[PDB]
Write a protein that binds this ligand. Structure first.
Ligand code: ATP
Ligand code: CA
Ligand code: CA
Ligand code: CL
Ligand code: K
Ligand code: MG
Ligand code: NA
Lengths: 350, 124
């Protein structure tokens, strides 16, 4: 029997079958209820008649009724799979509380009657998808970013760092700074358009100050985007000022450390004898790591922070957007997966 | 996580054991082929050494061919972790990339490391 693989993303669920190289279902982690529940894309097409909610806003499930609606949508509407007839691999955020993991397990075994399940840490799956057992994963998604050191297959919990700054904050920041040129994107639907602008036009400057200087010297920076209503918008230095907030959260009015500093701090929490292996295997994961220029910029900035004896290598796998899901698909395909899971009978008699 | 037949054979005697990842499984490499690696494939290597005190020492290497598929390199990594666990965590793990292998790993093969075109089909 073929396992189902479900990556519970703050912004989008990725779901599919073990042994595929990509998720066949990707949909927004949104539940709409009347102003009797709609999920994902259908909730957005009905935002007029629904109140919309994010049940996993910052990688942690906080609304369990709505999360169960998302899982029901996953199994029945997206995959058309009987959850009671497949093993399920479910992902969780780094540092997910054990009580949260237990609640998701209870729902799977007692509401969906899944016959067997396994819970995997997202960043560990991404590291495996990159062909590594040791490294530090920088996973930047929609609602959360984590830096996760991993040694010989297992995360080091005392060194994991969480940054509540990720893709949704960048979309919101682009919405804000486009007011400089007179745009007033503000509604939920407009936010989706600006998200697409961000993905299509933004990039990370190798050196922010020099890019500000060069971009002001000509109009070469300007790039166009065709809005749904046919109008064209032109974006200039917003293209790299927006993702610059990953490195300078002060742009968002936050005293938080940027992603380079956070990665450095995470490695420093690990004992000196394994840091070389972490610095040499900095693996990017997640949609918000897809910006052009990110690997080159992170390499410079981490090299500056780290002792000069270290060898910094930032790895940016081409299919890193879905590397959590891919790692899950690999793990749940292995001849050994059947020994890793918990069965419903074991759970029910525990 | 033990019932896998190749786990049951791993690290029982001093020597050299090589498996190839094939369709999400660990498959023994014919010993006549030891030292020759398909560039299209990923492998797991366990070197077992008899210590002076009689205990056994373990080094696990996972070797990644330049053209191996993502399922193959990911499975090699995962099987390495699982084999180490089965050996009670006492194995030291080594990532080996084609053309950049450690001198320890190349030293396992009297004839040195060689590569061949091709490999077993991806599971993906
Ligand atoms: N090419 C891109 N450039 C920049 N950002 C992108 C790109 N593609 C996707 N994103 C952003 O990635 C985010 C979603 O990626 P992901 O789906 O990996 O986050 P999540 O996993 O959904 O949420 P988390 O992992 O934080 O709980 C969205 O904010 C999306 O805009
Ligand atoms: Ca192959
Ligand atoms: Ca070990
Ligand atoms: Cl330095
Ligand atoms: K994330
Ligand atoms: Mg994610
Ligand atoms: Na290094």
């Amino acid at each position: 029997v073929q396992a189902l693989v479900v990556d519970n993303g703050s912004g989008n669920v990725k779901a599919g079958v073990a042994g595929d190289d990509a998720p066949r279902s990707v949909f927004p982690s949104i539940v709409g209820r009347p102003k009797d529940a709609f999920v994902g894309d259908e909730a957005q097409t009905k935002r007029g008649i629904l109140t919309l909610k994010y049940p996993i806003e910052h990688g942690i499930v906080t609304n369990w009724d709505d999360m169960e609606k998302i899982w029901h949508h996953t199994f029945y509407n997206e995959l058309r799979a009987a959850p009671e007839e497949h093993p399920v691999l479910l992902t969780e955020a780094p540092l997910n509380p054990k009580g949260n993991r237990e609640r998701m397990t209870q729902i799977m075994f007692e509401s969906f009657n899944v016959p067997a399940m396994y819970v995997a840490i997202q960043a560990v799956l991404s590291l495996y998808s990159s062909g590594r057992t040791t490294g530090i994963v920088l996973d930047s998604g929609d609602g959360v970013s984590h830096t996760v050191p991993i040694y010989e297959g297992y995360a080091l919990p005392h060194a994991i760092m969480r940054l509540d700054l990720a893709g949704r904050d960048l979309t919101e920041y682009l919405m804000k700074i486009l007011h400089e040129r007179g745009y007033g994107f503000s509604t939920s639907a407009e936010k989706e358009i600006v998200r697409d602008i961000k993905e299509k036009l933004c990039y990370i400057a190798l050196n922010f100050d020099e890019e500000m200087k060069t971009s002001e010297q000509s109009s070469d920076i300007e790039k166009s985007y065709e809005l749904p209503d046919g109008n064209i918008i032109t974006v200039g230095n917003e293209r790299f000022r927006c993702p610059e907030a990953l490195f300078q959260p002060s742009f968002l009015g936050k005293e938080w450390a940027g992603i380079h500093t956070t990665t450095f701090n995470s490695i420093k929490k690990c004992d000196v004898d394994i840091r070389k292996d972490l610095y040499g295997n900095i693996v990017l994961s997640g949609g918000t790591t897809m910006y052009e220029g990110i690997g080159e910029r992170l390499t410079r900035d981490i090299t500056t922070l780290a002792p000069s004896t270290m060898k910094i290598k930032v790895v940016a796998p081409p299919e890193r957007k879905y590397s959590v899901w891919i790692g899950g698909s690999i793990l749940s395909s292995l001849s050994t997966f059947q020994q890793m899971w918990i069965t419903k009978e074991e759970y029910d008699e525990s | 996580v033990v019932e896998h037949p190749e786990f049951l054979k791993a690290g029982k005697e001093p020597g050299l054991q090589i498996w190839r990842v094939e369709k999400f499984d660990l498959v023994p490499v014919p010993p006549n082929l030891y030292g020759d690696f398909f560039t299209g494939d990923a492998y797991v290597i366990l070197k077992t050494v008899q210590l002076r005190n009689g205990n056994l020492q373990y080094d696990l290497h996972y070797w990644l061919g330049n053209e191996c598929s993502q399922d193959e390199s990911g499975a090699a990594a995962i099987f390495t972790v699982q084999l180490d666990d089965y050996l009670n965590g006492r194995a030291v793990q080594h990532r080996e990339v084609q053309g950049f292998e450690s001198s320890t790993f190349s030293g396992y093969f009297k004839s040195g490391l060689k590569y061949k075109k091709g490999g077993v089909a991806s599971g993906f």
